[PDB]
Amino acid sequence: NFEKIENELKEINTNQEALKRNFLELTELKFILRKTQQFFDEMADPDL
C-alpha cells in the first residue's frame, strides 16, 4: 500500500510539472494568435 502511495504521488507531481510546462507556452501562443489578427486586419479584404 505505502509503496504505491509514494509512487502515485511522485507520478502526479511530475505530471503537474510537465503539464504546466506545456500549458504556459501554449497559452502565450493563444494570446499572440489573438492579437496578431488585429495586427493583420488593416486592409485584409483579400483571402491572404
Partner 1 sequence: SQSQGIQQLLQAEKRAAEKVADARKRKARRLKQAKEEAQMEVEQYRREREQEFQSKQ
Asked if 42 touches partner 1 (CB under 8 A), the answer is yes
Residue position matching grid coordinates 502511495: 5
Binding segment (CB under 8 A) for partner 1, from list 8-16, 18-26, 34-42 = 34-42
Asked if 43 touches partner 1 (CB under 8 A), the answer is yes
CB of 14 to partner 1, least distance (A): 43
All three cell numbers of 22, joined, read: 506545456
Measured between alpha carbons, how far is 22 from 30 in angstroms, rounded to an integer? 12
Amino acid at 9: L
Note the residues at the interface with partner 1 (CB under 8 A).
39-40, 42-44
